[PDB]
Amino acid sequence: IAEPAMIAECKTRTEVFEISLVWPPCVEVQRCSGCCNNRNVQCRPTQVQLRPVQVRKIEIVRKKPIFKKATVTLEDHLACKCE
Amino acid sequence: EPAMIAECKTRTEVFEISRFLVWPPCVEVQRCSGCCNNRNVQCRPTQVQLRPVQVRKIEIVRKKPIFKKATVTLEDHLACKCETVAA
């Protein structure tokens, strides 16, 4: 029936990041997720990256439907390591 | 091409284990994440599956460590469909 547990080996995993209405709200971005043996050892990033994304910047202000377009830079995580 | 939405489906996540070191400190389980069109349309599970797993509950005793076996029970998310929710 029950199988043994397997460590969440530490690598790049997909995460859903909501932006701070927009469209697209949230967006998919990489991030180190995972565990290290010696509990004191910690799993963190060894190379990050920047990818700016264009965003529809809707502007529903004073009875003025006047949307815009912003740019929001994302932080990806290209390759992690426990340390 | 600018930013596009994160389809609402299921992507794996790591989930920490809460008790006495308990190896594995954390397993990957599958969870429902993503977005929708309205502010009150949420990416929610449509079927979950309840899977048990074995963990070694290491307790150090007197001058020696024991390797107690134990079954935590995880919850996998198998489906997902943007749902209607006053929210």
Quick one: CA dihedral A62, A65, A66, A70, positive or negative? positive
Among candidates A18, A28, A54 on the partner chain, residue whose Cβ is nearest the Cβ of B2: A54
Using alpha carbons only, how large is chain A's radius of gyration in Å? Answer: 19
Hey, of A16, A22, A37, A42, which one would you mutate to test binding to chain B, going by the most B CBs within 10 A of its CB? Answer: A16
Structure method: X-ray
Q: Resolution of the deposited coordinates, in angstroms?
A: 3.0
Closest C-alpha to A26, from B47, B41, B27, B87: B41
The one-letter code for the residue type at B83 is E
**Residue A17: φ, ψ to 5°:** -100, 105
* DSSP label of A5: P
Establish if B75 touches chain A: CB-CB under 8 angstroms.
Answer: no
CB A17 within 8 A of CB A27: yes
Helices (H) and strands (E) counted in chain B, each on its own, are 0, 7
Burial status of residue B69 (CB atoms within 10 A of its CB: 0-12, 13-18, 19 or more): exposed
Residue ranges of domains in chain A, CATH in brackets: 1-83 (2.10.90.10)
Establish if A82 touches chain B: CB-CB under 8 angstroms.
Answer: no
CA distance to A6, A34, A41, B55, per residue, from A38 (Å):
16, 13, 5, 16
CB A18 within 8 A of CB A26: yes
CA-CA distance, B41 to B29, in Å (whole number)?
A: 24
| Helix or strand run (H / E) with residue A63 | none
- Tokens found for residue B63: 């001058």
SS percent in chain B: helix, strand, coil, step 5: 0, 60, 40
Burial status of residue B6 (CB atoms within 10 A of its CB: 0-12, 13-18, 19 or more): buried
- Tokens found for residue B35: 């977005």
CA-CA distance, A59 to A56, in Å (whole number)?
A: 9
Helices (H) and strands (E) counted in chain A, each on its own, are 0, 9
Nearest CA in chain A to B32: A16
